[PDB]
């Protein structure tokens, strides 16, 4: 009688799907993988860079059944996207595990669609946790694994031996475009919190604590006469912040999160950068070589692509009380600044219909007319911008 992983895989593999998508920006075609989150509603998680600038979404199950899917949420900061199947019929959901209990040395199984061949299974172990540094602006707390992962495994599942999802295969370190035994996946607890926000709002409510800091190396640890050689170092607390309301001062060193030790500042930033607003958590601090614990609650932070689904390069939000859609800032050379819109513009209406907020506006983007006339105002002036 032989040990095998086939008994567990015949259970979970239907929950892993492959994703066929066609779009443009210059038409292109690409493909990735995805994991069934809610078998009833048809929720499939994948990477946001898999569904960026996507017109048509087609999914193929393990059994060859084809369905259609629509965008639900997207988060380029964490590279997690959620889609929902149209006409969900006869699906199998996957069990999720608690990634905060993961240990380096546990066995891992990667499931995806490398090179569009179909559902491909690979094995490995947890190479490391908390790895980060590929893109300093992203909320990255990747799990490293020697599980073979190539182009297409994106949005795939990284699981344990009991069929429980531990991570979503995301990216690899390959000097040649082919796996050399280093893949990265986003832990489940992160994806657990991210999806739950995308279920209710279609976006993630980013809450912040209001603190600045930087990584603790052994060099700075010696400078502050602090014993811990790694962790989060408290630079300053912002006024009226939860940390200020909790009693956190500059010169403190963060060591743990809810008792769970802290691996780095880069992981800690991604940890709470995905937790929903109001999440009650406990932290371990170290000021003057004395251990302190504090309990905290996240606060709101108050801050185009998410609304057009195809025109990026402009951060926009609502204005005042029913004052339209003001655009915060624009990046040069992007699909937004290519139509003339600049920072400070306030979209008041479009196509003979007034726009009080971002919800009133998308009522026209869903009307999908042939030509759009945006009645923005720059300053006290009244102008128009046309599209399509």
């Amino acid at each position: 009688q032989m040990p095998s992983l086939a008994p567990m895989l015949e259970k979970v593999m239907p929950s892993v799907v492959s994703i066929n998508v066609e779009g443009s920006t210059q038409k292109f075609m690409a493909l990735g993988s995805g994991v069934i989150i809610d078998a009833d509603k048809g929720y499939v998680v994948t990477n946001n860079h898999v569904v960026d600038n996507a017109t048509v979404i087609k999914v193929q199950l393990s059994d060859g059944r084809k369905f259609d899917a629509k965008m639900v949420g997207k988060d380029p900061r964490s590279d997690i996207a959620l889609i929902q199947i149209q006409n969900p019929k006869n699906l199998t959901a996957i069990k999720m595990a608690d990634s905060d209990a993961l240990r380096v040395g546990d066995y891992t199984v990667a499931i995806g669609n490398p090179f569009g061949l179909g559902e491909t299974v690979t094995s490995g172990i947890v190479s490391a946790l908390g790895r980060s540094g590929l893109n300093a602006e992203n909320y990255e707390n990747f799990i490293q694994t020697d599980a073979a992962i190539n182009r297409g495994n994106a949005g795939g599942a990284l699981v344990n031996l009991n069929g429980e999802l531990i991570g979503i295969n995301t990216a690899i370190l390959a000097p040649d475009g082919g796996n050399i035994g280093i893949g990265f996946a986003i832990p489940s607890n992160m994806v657990k919190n991210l999806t739950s926000q995308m279920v209710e709002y279609g976006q993630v409510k980013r809450g912040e604590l209001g603190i600045m800091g930087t990584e603790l190396n052994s060099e700075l640890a010696k400078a502050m006469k602090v014993d811990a050689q790694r962790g989060a170092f408290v630079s300053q607390v912002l006024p009226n912040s939860s940390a200020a309301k909790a009693g956190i001062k500059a010169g403190d060193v963060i060591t743990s999160l809810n008792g769970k030790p802290i691996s780095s500042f880069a992981a800690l930033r991604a940890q709470v950068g995905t937790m929903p607003v109001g999440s009650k958590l406990t932290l371990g601090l170290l000021r003057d070589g004395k251990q302190v614990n504090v309990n905290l609650e996240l606060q709101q932070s108050s801050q185009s692509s998410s609304i057009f689904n195809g025109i990026e390069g402009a951060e926009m939000s609502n204005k005042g009380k029913d004052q339209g859609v003001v655009v915060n800032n624009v990046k040069t050379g992007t699909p937004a600044a290519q139509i003339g819109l600049k920072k400070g513009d306030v979209i008041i209406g479009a196509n003979q219909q007034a726009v009080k907020n971002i919800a009133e506006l998308r009522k026209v983007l869903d009307s999908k007319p042939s030509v759009l006339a945006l009645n923005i105002q720059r300053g006290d002036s009244t102008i128009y911008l046309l599209m399509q």
Partner: peptide, 5 residues
């Protein structure tokens, strides 16, 4: 170097 999937 670092690459996506």
């Amino acid at each position: 170097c670092y690459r996506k999937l």
